[PDB]
């Protein structure tokens, strides 16, 4: 069965600037973010999912139950709140983020040792791919 648990190091990060611009992330933060190579530390524990998006500058932490809508606090990204649901779709994880921006959400899946993440908002697409790694990063 598909299991996202692991530490995943960024390999490629396509069109991130335009994704952040579509979220109205301010220009100074976009400049910082353009130099980052965020990683993912994930624990899948039943349908309780923890996804820590980690960077040297700032993290964004998700901690939710698959299937259950929650209030997602996007402080540190665009500082909005979304009513968000993450759901299984076969071997993929689908996320719908209801709120100010149309078409906001993402899809996450695995191909071999690669974690794939397509982030979407307002018709803009950012695609990230991470490689599973084994050297422990201190919490
Ligand atoms: C803008 C910005 C950042 C963007 C984080 C994003 C966009 C996280 C998306 C997480 C998802 C979609 C998780 C499912 O794997 C981080 C915090 C890296 C650094 C500071 C500024």
Q: What does the overall shape look like? A: globular
Distance between the termini: 27 Å
CATH class: Mainly Beta
Helix/strand order, N-terminal first = EHHEEEEEEEEE
Q: Quote the beta fraction.
A: over 45%
GO molecular function, one term: fatty acid binding
Keywords: Cytoplasm, Lipid droplet, Methylation, Retinol-binding, Transport, Vitamin A
Function: Cytoplasmic retinol-binding protein. Accepts retinol from the transport protein STRA6, and thereby contributes to retinol uptake, storage and retinoid homeostasis.
Main location: cytoplasm
Give a nutshell description of this structure.
All-trans-retinol binds at residues 40, 62, 108. By secondary structure, this protein is mainly beta.
Keywords:
monomer, 139 residues, Lipocalin, ten-stranded antiparallel beta sheet, 2 helices, 10 strands, lipid droplet, CRBP1, Fatty_acid-bd, retinoid binding, all-trans-retinol binding
Mind explaining what this structure looks like?
Cytoplasmic retinol-binding protein. Accepts retinol from the transport protein STRA6, and thereby contributes to retinol uptake, storage and retinoid homeostasis. Interacts (only as retinol-free apoprotein) with STRA6. It is found in: Cytoplasm; Lipid droplet. The protein has two helices and ten strands. The chain is mostly beta strands. It has a single domain, classed as Calycin beta-barrel core domain (Lipocalin), CATH 2.40.128.20. It has a ten-stranded antiparallel sheet. The radius of gyration is 14 Å and the shape is globular. The chain starts with 5 loop residues before the first strand and ends in a 6-residue tail after the last strand. Retinol (RTL) is lined by residues 20, 25, 29, 33, 36, 38, 40, 51, 53, 55, 57-60, 62, 76-77, 106, 108, 117, 119. Retinol (RTL) binds next to α2, β3, β4, β8 and β9.
């Amino acid at each position: 069965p598909v299991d996202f648990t692991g530490y995943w190091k960024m390999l490629v990060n396509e069109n991130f600037e335009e994704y952040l611009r579509a979220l109205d992330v301010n220009v100074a933060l976009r400049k910082i973010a353009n130099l980052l190579k965020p990683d993912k530390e994930i624990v899948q524990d039943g349908d309780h999912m923890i996804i820590r998006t980690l960077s040297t500058f700032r993290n964004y932490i998700m901690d939710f139950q698959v299937g259950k809508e929650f209030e997602e606090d996007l402080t540190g990204i665009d500082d909005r709140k979304c009513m968000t649901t993450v759901s299984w779709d076969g071997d993929k994880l689908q996320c719908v983020q209801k709120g100010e921006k149309e078409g906001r959400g993402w899809t996450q899946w695995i191909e071999g040792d690669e974690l794939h993440l397509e982030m979407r908002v307002e018709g803009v697409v950012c695609k990230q791919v991470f490689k599973k790694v084994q050297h422990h990063h201190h919490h």
